Ligand binder design. Structure first.
Ligand SMILES: *SC1=NC(C)(C)N(O)C1(C)C
Ligand SMILES: [Cl-]
Ligand SMILES: [K+]
Length: 163
């Protein structure tokens, strides 16, 4: 298991534009296209992202290319953020993946707002961090995924993603 396999499980793979859990146009492996309700706007974003006039459909290779860029972007968002970088640096590689996962789903600014959870993670108070992370819109709106991510912070193992 690794961050790519983890997010591929949490995000799925769909080759045509679809709406994500928040109702936003998305494609591939959780590649958010736009928060606009305009499908035409989402299609324009897709063409710009892929570099060709699509029909709203991409190939698996193209989905994986966006996915690699998006994982990279999540890590760079962490490393450039003054609140997220110290927490990331303090974590083992398994829990680093859990933090990347959160930033992939919610963005750098959103995760950086989890001030008290971040402090508990940096303190390595894993059960307390788990309780605090669940008191969130994130947990309430995507509880199964949030439970997998929180369990990964709790244990530092991949048990929530095996079988
Ligand atoms: S969270 C969670 N997942 C498993 C089943 C590995 N656990 O033992 C916890 C920590 C309750
Ligand atoms: Cl709490
Ligand atoms: K998804």
């Amino acid at each position: 298991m690794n961050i790519f396999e983890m997010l591929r499980i949490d995000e799925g793979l769909r080759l045509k534009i679809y709406k994500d859990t928040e109702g936003y146009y998305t494609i591939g492996i959780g590649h958010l296209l736009t928060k606009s309700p305009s499908l035409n706007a989402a299609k324009s974003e897709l063409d710009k992202a892929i570099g060709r006039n699509t029909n709203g459909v991409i190939t698996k290779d193209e989905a994986e290319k966006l996915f690699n860029q998006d994982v990279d972007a999540a890590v760079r968002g962490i490393l450039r953020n003054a609140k997220l970088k110290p927490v990331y640096d303090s974590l083992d590689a398994v829990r680093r993946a859990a933090l990347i996962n959160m930033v992939f789903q919610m963005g750098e600014t959103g995760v950086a707002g989890f001030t008290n959870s971040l402090r508990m993670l940096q303190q390595k108070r894993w059960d307390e961090a788990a309780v605090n992370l669940a008191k969130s819109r994130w947990y309430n709106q995507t509880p199964n995924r949030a439970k997998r991510v929180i369990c990964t912070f709790r244990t530092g193992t991949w048990d929530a993603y095996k079988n």
